[PDB]
Ligand binder design. Structure first.
Ligand SMILES: Nc1nc2c(ncn2[C@@H]2O[C@H](COP(=O)(O)OP(=O)(O)O)[C@@H](O)[C@H]2O)c(=O)[nH]1
Length: 315
């Protein structure tokens, strides 16, 4: 309750997007409602890094690729990354937590991300990776590489949030279309990152800190998440139902999650009343052993709506 942690709200959070898709997702975040974090784009494609939101960029494998980017080849991404080990670390120093975000299935992102996680993880930084999985319409070829990297990535991250791009279609449905599909991806990834950092950076009346997060998140590996967003007299219960009922949490057995982290983002009116509801609903779907951390986020530039965001760790 009363006693807060060592480096609570103060935690220096960096967010790095690897490869193309990643850069896109990141640059989206910048030009959006994602504050308290330092953005960074890291691509082997020197070209891509030209003129982008994030004020910190890192070109990988200058030698290996010559600013031409690992032609969808993971190995080239991994090689370019190892070449830049030093540079990677220089960019990471001072971070309490790092967000490696990227679209798996490509070359830069796929092969480079695991290395970067490896670095940070060594520096003793809370390493969380938020990555997508090719849309069905991307070919088994690409979908094959994704699993591949994800397997490797998992080996060196405190936690790994997978996002089955398929599900995004589920949602979209009618308006499903390349533009929207990837735009949606961008958005969801932003949610995942914003989802957690906001809990640390923009606390509400009841708050969770870095110590709380470190717990449910440190070396848990393999996570999934889902969002809900209601409003009106029962925005609480509703927004929560919607969260669990989120497709992105369709085939997930919360009873299994060793750790569950929750985020309630609402106006200055978010009463303790609701908070209780949010947690009660959760406490049922969770395994009595599971360690559940529920926190509040405060947002003014938002009204009656109350968005809940759950994250199942140590799956
Ligand atoms: N969210 C999001 N995902 C993307 C975008 N572009 C591509 N992707 C996905 O992420 C993967 C990475 O592809 P790409 O960025 O070309 O790989 P890179 O070689 O690491 O640059 C793809 O296979 C897609 O499924 C984008 O703009 N946004």
């Amino acid at each position: 309750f009363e006693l807060v942690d060592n480096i609570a709200q103060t935690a220096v959070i960096k967010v790095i997007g690897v490869g193309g898709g990643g850069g896109n997702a990141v640059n989206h975040m910048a030009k959006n409602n994602v504050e308290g974090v330092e953005f960074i784009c890291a691509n082997t494609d020197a070209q891509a890094l030209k003129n982008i939101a994030a004020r910190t960029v890192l070109q990988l494998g200058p030698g290996v690729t010559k600013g031409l980017g690992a032609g969808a080849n993971p190995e080239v991404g991994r090689q370019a990354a190892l070449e830049d080990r030093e540079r990677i670390s220089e960019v990471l120093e001072g971070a309490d937590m790092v967000f490696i975000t990227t679209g798996m299935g490509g070359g830069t992102g796929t092969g480079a991300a695991p290395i970067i996680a490896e670095v940070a993880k060594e520096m003793g930084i809370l390493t969380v990776a938020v990555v997508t999985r090719p849309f069905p319409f991307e070919g088994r070829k690409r979908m094959q590489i994704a699993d591949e990297g994800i397997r490797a990535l998992a080996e060196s991250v405190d936690s790994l949030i997978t996002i089955p791009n398929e599900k995004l279609l589920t949602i979209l449905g009618k308006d499903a279309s390349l533009l929207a599909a990837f735009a949606k991806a961008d958005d969801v990834l932003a949610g995942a990152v914003r989802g957690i950092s906001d809990i640390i950076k923009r606390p509400g009346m009841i708050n969770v800190d870095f110590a709380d997060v470190k717990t449910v998140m440190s070396e848990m590996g393999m996570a999934m998440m889902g969002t809900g967003c209601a409003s009106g007299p029962n925005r609480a219960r509703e927004a929560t139902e919607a969260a669990i009922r989120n497709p992105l949490l369709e085939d997930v057995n919360l009873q299994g999650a060793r750790g569950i982290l929750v985020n309630i983002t609402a106006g200055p009116d978010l009463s303790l009343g609701e908070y209780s509801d949010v947690g009660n609903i959760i406490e049922q779907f969770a395994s009595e052993h599971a360690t559940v951390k529920v926190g509040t986020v405060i947002d003014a530039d938002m009204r009656d709506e109350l968005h809940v965001t759950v994250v199942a760790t140590g799956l």
